[PDB]
Amino acid sequence: MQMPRRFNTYCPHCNEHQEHEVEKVRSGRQTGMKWIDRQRERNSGIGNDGKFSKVPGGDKPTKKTDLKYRCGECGKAHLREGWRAGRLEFQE
Amino acid sequence: GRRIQGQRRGRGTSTFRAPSHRYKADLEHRKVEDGDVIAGTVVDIEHDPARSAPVAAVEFEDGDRRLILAPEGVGVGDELQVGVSAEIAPGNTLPLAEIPEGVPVCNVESSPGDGGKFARASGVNAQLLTHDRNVAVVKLPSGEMKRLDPQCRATIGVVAGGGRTDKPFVKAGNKHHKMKARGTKWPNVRGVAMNAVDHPFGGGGRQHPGKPKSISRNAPPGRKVGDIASKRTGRGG
Amino acid sequence: TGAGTPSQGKKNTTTHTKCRRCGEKSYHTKKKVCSSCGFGKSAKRRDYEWQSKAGE
Amino acid sequence: ARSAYSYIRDAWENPGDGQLAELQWQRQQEWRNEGAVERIERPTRLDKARSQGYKAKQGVIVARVSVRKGSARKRRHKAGRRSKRQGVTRITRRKDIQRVAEERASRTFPNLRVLNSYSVGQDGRQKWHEVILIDPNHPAIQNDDDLSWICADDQADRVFRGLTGAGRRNRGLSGKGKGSEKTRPSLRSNGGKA
RNA sequence: GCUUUACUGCAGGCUGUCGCUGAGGACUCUCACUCCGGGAGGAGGACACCGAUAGCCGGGCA
RNA sequence: ACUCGUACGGUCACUGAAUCCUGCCCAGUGCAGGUAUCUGAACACCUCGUACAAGAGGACGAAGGACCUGUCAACGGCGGG
RNA sequence: AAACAUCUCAGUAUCGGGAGGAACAGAAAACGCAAUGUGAUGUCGUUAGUAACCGCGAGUGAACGCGAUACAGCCCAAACC
Numbered sequence A: 001m002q003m004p005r006r007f008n009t010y011c012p013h014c015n016e017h018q019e020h021e022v023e024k025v026r027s028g029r030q031t032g033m034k035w036i037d038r039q040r041e042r043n044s045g046i047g048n049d050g051k052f053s054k055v056p057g058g059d060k061p062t063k064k065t066d067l068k069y070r071c072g073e074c075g076k077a078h079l080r081e082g083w084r085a086g087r088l089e090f091q092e
Numbered sequence B: 001g002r003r004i005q006g007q008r009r010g011r012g013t014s015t016f017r018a019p020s021h022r023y024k025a026d027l028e029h030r031k032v033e034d035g036d037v038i039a040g041t042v043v044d045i046e047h048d049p050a051r052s053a054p055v056a057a058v059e060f061e062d063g064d065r066r067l068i069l070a071p072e073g074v075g076v077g078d079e080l081q082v083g084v085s086a087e088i089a090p091g092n093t094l095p096l097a098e099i100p101e102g103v104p105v106c107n108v109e110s111s112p113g114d115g116g117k118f119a120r121a122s123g124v125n126a127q128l129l130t131h132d133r134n135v136a137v138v139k140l141p142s143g144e145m146k147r148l149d150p151q152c153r154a155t156i157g158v159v160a161g162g163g164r165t166d167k168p169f170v171k172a173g174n175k176h177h178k179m180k181a182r183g184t185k186w187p188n189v190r191g192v193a194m195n196a197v198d199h200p201f202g203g204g205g206r207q208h209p210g211k212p213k214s215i216s217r218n219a220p221p222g223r224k225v226g227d228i229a230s231k232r233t234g235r236g237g
Numbered sequence C: 001t002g003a004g005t006p007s008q009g010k011k012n013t014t015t016h017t018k019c020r021r022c023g024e025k026s027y028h029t030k031k032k033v034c035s036s037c038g039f040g041k042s043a044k045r046r047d048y049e050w051q052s053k054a055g056e
Numbered sequence D: 001a002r003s004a005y006s007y008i009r010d011a012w013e014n015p016g017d018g019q020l021a022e023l024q025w026q027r028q029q030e031w032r033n034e035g036a037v038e039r040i041e042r043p044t045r046l047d048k049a050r051s052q053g054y055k056a057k058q059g060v061i062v063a064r065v066s067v068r069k070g071s072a073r074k075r076r077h078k079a080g081r082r083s084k085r086q087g088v089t090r091i092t093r094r095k096d097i098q099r100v101a102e103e104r105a106s107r108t109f110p111n112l113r114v115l116n117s118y119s120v121g122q123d124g125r126q127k128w129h130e131v132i133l134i135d136p137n138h139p140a141i142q143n144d145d146d147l148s149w150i151c152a153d154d155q156a157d158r159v160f161r162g163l164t165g166a167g168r169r170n171r172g173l174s175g176k177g178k179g180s181e182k183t184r185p186s187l188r189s190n191g192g193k194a
Numbered sequence E: 001g002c003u004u005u006a007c008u009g010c011a012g013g014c015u016g017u018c019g020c021u022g023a024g025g026a027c028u029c030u031c032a033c034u035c036c037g038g039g040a041g042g043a044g045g046a047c048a049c050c051g052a053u054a055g056c057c058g059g060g061c062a
Numbered sequence F: 001a002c003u004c005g006u007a008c009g010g011u012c013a014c015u016g017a018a019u020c021c022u023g024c025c026c027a028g029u030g031c032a033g034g035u036a037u038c039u040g041a042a043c044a045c046c047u048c049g050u051a052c053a054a055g056a057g058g059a060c061g062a063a064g065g066a067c068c069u070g071u072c073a074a075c076g077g078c079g080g081g
Numbered sequence G: 001a002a003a004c005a006u007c008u009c010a011g012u013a014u015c016g017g018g019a020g021g022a023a024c025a026g027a028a029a030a031c032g033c034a035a036u037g038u039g040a041u042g043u044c045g046u047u048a049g050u051a052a053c054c055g056c057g058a059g060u061g062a063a064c065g066c067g068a069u070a071c072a073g074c075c076c077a078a079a080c081c
Ligand SMILES: [Cl-]
Pocket: A024, A064, A065, A066, A067, A088
């Protein structure tokens, strides 16, 4: 489906309607220093590693919308519920 | 499954051992201080139970009596010599350096003084081709060109008993008698005629190998069976 | 040949005999080892925890 | 001023440099040709020995023991085992090499008792330790106020019961506070959890 | 119990790296180390073996 | 252990006396050889980060794989129109 | 664990080595109710199924302190001779 790159809507920070800019959430890079990372190293040994011997689940036929709505005046973004969309293309 | 036959072998149990106590002598070149003066006289010719080939009994000047890996054409009364200055006649042993290129040789040492390792079976021989101050090039019976220290001793002539392989065994019983004198388990049951538990080719409603017969060099014992690291198979091409 | 009664006839071989060290008829005269006390194998006396129940 | 001993100690802080380095390169050649347990007239590291209790006296013995380097020389399972217990290669013994060395020495001298031991280097495949043993039956020791303690019956086979310095450290008894909940007073009374 | 391109691992083989290990992306040497020789000495040589680790193969086995 | 053995050896497999014979297929799988380029771990090395460290990235690249080739008395195949 | 691989059964069964009448531990490179505080070590009661671990599932599981029992503190190496 199509979606405008910018549009007026409620900003939970400003607490009033303003032009927002929509962007797809780009994945953040992992640091490898989280607790789960240390547990993986710590608990992996001889034989099966329990949960750490598992591999990547799979895929649902269509994913939900994963977007960021950025207020055009205070610059703060907010998140919203996503909805299933085979494809999402922005207009302008 | 169970260990395959090739694995039972290594344990060295009675069934797989050679009847060593029944063997005569460990054929090795005599040790000479130097000078070469060492000579002896052939006193008898005997059968070697470990090689199905003749061997010669020699009485050396300094009283030593030892069996020797006999080349063809050696008889009672003959005088053999061992040393740098040994004459160049069949039955004598001297370093590849003192040997004239183009002469057939047997019982060649791999390392000077090891007593002889190559070309010792019935009727075979090595071929001394090239000389040098550093390397003596010998062609072994397999056809390979081997570079050896010219100091490696050897015996002039071809090993006795040539042609042994020309006669067929004809019957099972004859193989039997020979096998009884070797460190070997015989007869041989085909892998494909066994059960899955006993061999990688075992099992099935009819006889055939489960997978392809060419096995990797890296295969572990118990699995390395069939055509080991075959560069090719069949006859075509 | 039946593995039962008919195969019992060839049993005239002496193996386990009265042991010099413990007195039991367990000294295997072929192995020169007592299966009961360990004589011939161990200076220490043969004994195992599984010869009795675990908590006893 | 600096004791002469301080120089032996200081040299051994870096067994791979200076004169010591060359001695080792020379010595090990002969050591590799010696047996498992070799009684030696004098300690290679005099300072270390005296520091641990050594005395140039009757009934005091020193011996160098060689032990292979590496993990457990272990046989693979011959029956059912869950994956966790199927290892062979990475399993290592819980008793350190120095301790193995002390035991091999004590067995060699059934009548003597281990007092202490120290390292004298290693090559690529084995380590060497010199063990100081004591004759608890010799009067020259039974009358020494510094060593006579080792003559008491309860000190018999001390090395085999982990009463050695290397035994006690390897048992996790070094610390008196945090971390020694499962080691003191013994590994066994704590259920074998350290 | 058995099989395999079932899941997960474990031996074993191959290969890089570190230690043993030294002198002047290809090279010489000798002193450790290895092998041959009764010895003298010869071959090989910082490699190999061995210890540690990493990648690949791995129903041979659990 | 084989081995008091050394290629006329002995190991690993297939077929199963003699006689007449044993065609075509290397795409898949297996084994083996080669390999410009691609891919390919760790140590050491370079950059960033941290007064250190965790960590992220780069350069180099072994065996192996991609790719090419050889091989069926190697596993096996030899149809429809 | 209602299957099962980490986990659990369990450092249990069993095996190897060895002491004593009891063993072992033990005079702080401790504790960390953070203090102007405690003062070797076992053990008992409690702290507490608490903190901590864990396909964060099932399960697993201390310590300091406190109240008791009994109380005990010393010898080398070295400097200088
Ligand atoms: Cl989206």
